[PDB]
């Protein structure tokens, strides 16, 4: 059971929003929509297709935030000449994952980007 304004799927509740926000703001926003609510997470292909259809039929075409952030921030970045990494000049500090309402493929873009999103919680 999900509130009237959310859609249910496999014991979970999902809801798309079209108020453009960066990743951090979207996540924070989702937590305030219902207890246990966060940006959507994908544990399978069926769940992914469900959410994509939901987003499209509600707002069409657009990019929607997914619950993955700072995806390469903790990676082991090294210079191939073994030089110590001190001086840096990153164009983007962090990357986040999103999907287009037209397909279930994961895409990456800077977390500063403005996009739609989908919230989810366990019922």
């Amino acid at each position: 059971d999900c509130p009237s304004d959310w859609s249910s799927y496999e014991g979970h509740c999902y809801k798309p929003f079209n108020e453009p926000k960066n990743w951090a703001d979207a996540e924070n926003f989702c937590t305030q929509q219902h207890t246990g609510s966060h940006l959507v997470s994908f544990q399978s292909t069926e769940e992914a297709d469900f959410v994509v259809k939901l987003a499209f039929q509600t707002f069409d075409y657009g990019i929607f935030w997914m619950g993955l952030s700072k995806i390469w921030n903790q990676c082991n970045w090294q210079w191939s000449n073994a030089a110590m990494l001190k001086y840096t000049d990153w164009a983007e500090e962090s990357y986040c994952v999103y999907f287009k309402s037209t397909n279930n493929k994961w895409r990456s873009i800077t977390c500063r980007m403005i996009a739609n999103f989908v919230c989810e919680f366990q019922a």
Partner: protein, 129 residues
Amino acid sequence: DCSSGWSSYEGHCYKVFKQSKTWTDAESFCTKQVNGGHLVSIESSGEADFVGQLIAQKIKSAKIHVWIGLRAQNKEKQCSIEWSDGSSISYENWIEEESKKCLGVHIETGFHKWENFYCEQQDPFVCEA
């Protein structure tokens, strides 16, 4: 002192290569051009300025970027340990080209800012020794 065709800056030798190669092939190629060769490493403002201008001398297109020697060692698609909801990453559905673990500089910033690019992309590069 640097070999013919190579430019020197602070005791090092550099050379821009117009041929397009993947990050890995570029790196491998550099090791064979000169002893101690590798894809360029940018370790200071001064070096970044010099390398940026060196590149600008040969590359005048915006349809490609230039490979530098910084790369994320991890084999995984991403290095995050969990979703914002706490669950583990037990499933993925990445578009290969969307995992950008190799860095390069683009003409849009005068070849200065490091941008994330798909490692298997073929692009010009710079070797340093």
